[model samples]
Target: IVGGYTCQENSVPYQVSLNSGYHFCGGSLINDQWVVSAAHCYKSRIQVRLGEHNINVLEGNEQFVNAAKIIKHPNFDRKTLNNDIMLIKLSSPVKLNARVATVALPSSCAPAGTQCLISGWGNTLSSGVNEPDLLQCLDAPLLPQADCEASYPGKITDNMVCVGFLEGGKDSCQGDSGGPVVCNGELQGIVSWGYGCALPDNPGVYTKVCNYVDWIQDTIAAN
Candidate 1:
């Protein structure tokens, strides 16, 4: 993430790497067998790596497993980036511990000015350079709905939330899609889209996780 800090090891226990041979996106563990990510991160073949901190090293606490099923939101709109959420069922349940665990889904919507945390192994710069081996995190406040709408005009749908500095500096960039946007220790948003990595008058947009809580719980219950 641009203008962020290296996250403390295991501090983000629910964070997971979505890999196809290498890390491409990030996700959050919601249960022993389920992960929450962005639908756009979907690939033909995926290996979910849990408890991973440094991607280049063989972290002994990591759990590598194939996805048994990937269920993207049926109404996902690629053009407008609406409903850009997905749930992946693991082939087998993971063993949760200090280094790996599930993050709680949001019970209610966070206020507009809520201070939230976004973490990922995304690009450290707008041009995708200095990508760190360690996961990075940034603290950004959720933008007001009107401010977001004003920033993106008609593109800001009800299913999305804007989070970042209006003046630019910090943001979740490429390779960070599908990562968790945690607020008050709950998963509030999913990294989805933006104008560019980090730019003025443009804050990073995210999938409003609160809008899909029912879908997530029901999918897990029936699958």
Candidate 2:
């Protein structure tokens, strides 16, 4: 969340925190009983907290539920981070409201240059422990695929998408992994990885959500 601002409370209703004792990752509420996140955020146990704004405070709107099951993409490659997406099924269904709701999954890929909304409680600074108490929001454009490939030679894949400013002012950082990157009000990406917080020519990379829409739906249905 480098170079971002505090988001208006509940403005991003689909935003969620993947927590243990403290916020470790961000996720999106795709439905009453499921969340879409990054496989890299997985832990033996994870609690999904919805309607979260200020992670340090006890926001009355929050709903905490344990994960019943976590299904990571079968071919997920940790080395290259290909197929980084994962789905978490809640132990119980959550009650959605004005402060908590589901975000629609993208039906198709977001074209390069789309200004997408990215929000999380991830570190706000480029270095050091400056994780924000309040959720931070940044509107970053989807970077050109060719440029993304050039920035990370042999690392970028079709399953990944790059989003941020190449000049390096704003981007998602640590603890922001698994967070949603919504474009045109639909889930377009899941915060995956980057070289640094917001470094020049190293835009933040994300799990291209459009590539796994069928897998997500089929997994949820089968489970």
Candidate 3:
């Protein structure tokens, strides 16, 4: 089964398009004034759509939330895919609606094997292309520290989480990076990278949100 909720009809409340003019991913509403997405999702100019889909079909009821400030993780490493999280502060608080509601943050610890949801509008398959009008989701089980370590064999640091199709077919692909991995409805992981989409031996990798709890809070406070 797919993970989390889909952005159908009017489900997604806060979706942002990259300055590059692409609607490639989805983000979570953290508050009336803040949004959480992947650091790599930002470009020169981002336009936030508070409600509705169809990038070219604006219905006017949607609010255009511009970025007042963007805080990318200080140590974000593009090559190694480290510190891949980011937070965007909107110029003003977005009025809450059924289409736009804040997701809850995990206050406690998430144990191994916690099944979570990953949502995005990325490639249908690793070698395939990105879907323009569809937002898909998949269920990803949390990887244990030992299994994750063994899989990466020295590359799986404490800051990352491993997830994907155990039987190998479903997975988060390119363009899905920097989105949500929600566990029990609580924010847990941020899509970072994988061994190349849905490869049989290589699942997906995510930046452990728990590890960066302090960073998220501090970054918000700084702004």
lDDT on C-alpha atoms for all candidate structures: 0.93, 0.94, 0.70
The CA-based lDDT of model 1 is what? 0.93
After superposing candidate 1, which stretches have Cα over 4 Å from the reference?
A: none
lDDT tens per residue, model 2, 1-223: 9999889999999999999998999999999999999999989899999988889888699999999999999999999999999999999999999999999999899999899999999988887768789999998899999999989999999999999998997999999999999999999999999998898889999999999999999999999
Candidate 2 minimal-lDDT segment of 10 residues: 123-132
Q: What is the TM-score of each candidate against the true structure?
A: 0.98, 0.99, 0.86
| Full-model lDDT, candidate 3 | 0.70
Model 2, 67: alpha-carbon shift in Å? 0.5
Better of 2 and 3 by TM-score: 2
- Candidate with better TM-score, 1 vs 3: 1
Off by over 4 Å in 2: none
Residue-pair clashes per candidate: 0, 0, 0
Number of residue pairs clashing in candidate 2, backbone atoms closer than 3 angstroms, sequence gap of 3 or more or interchain: 0
- Clashing residue pairs, backbone N/CA/C < 3 A, model 3: none
Root mean square deviation (Cα) for candidate 1? 0.8
lDDT for each residue of candidate 1 in 1-223, tens digit (9 for 90 to 100): 8999999998999999999998999999999999999999988779999998898899798999999999999999878879999999999999999999999999999999999999999889976476689989899999998889999988988999999999998999988999999999999999999998889888999999999999998999999
Number of clashing residue pairs, candidate 1: 0
